[PDB]
Write a protein that binds this ligand. Structure first.
Ligand code: NAG
Ligand code: MG
Length: 112
């Protein structure tokens, strides 16, 4: 099935911020479980970059937040100071399991 939903593709420009909302099923277990944002890598693993246990990758020091909103069965990942190096294939999810694939594209600032 389709337990998690979010934005399939997120397009931004260098310097921008994004706010990515992931939706989960309306259950107590899901409201209180670990939430995560991870980047899919060439090895096949999805490396956690931020989680609701308070974990943060050094790649996101000073520029990211993950906020759980149990009151509407969502959580939000905020990512700031984007650069082209943030382009990639990500997942938002619950647990370690339930997840949704997000493609983030960060393009160059257009020439004037
Ligand atoms: C969920 O609730 C939070 C807190 O009130 C709100 O800021 C956010 O917009 C809501 N999310 C959605 C998808 O309605
Ligand atoms: Mg590009």
């Amino acid at each position: 099935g389709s337990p998690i939903f979010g934005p399939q593709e997120v397009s931004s420009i260098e310097g921008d911020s994004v706010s990515i909302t992931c939706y989960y099923p309306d259950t107590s277990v899901n409201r209180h479980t670990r939430k995560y944002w991870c980047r899919q890598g060439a090895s096949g693993m999805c490396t956690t970059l931020i989680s609701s246990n308070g974990y943060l990758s050094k790649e996101y020091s000073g520029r990211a937040n993950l906020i759980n909103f149990p009151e509407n069965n969502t959580f939000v990942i905020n990512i700031e100071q984007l650069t082209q190096d943030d382009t990639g294939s990500y997942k938002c999810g619950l647990g370690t399991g339930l997840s949704f694939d997000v493609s983030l594209e960060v393009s160059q600032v257009p020439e004037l």
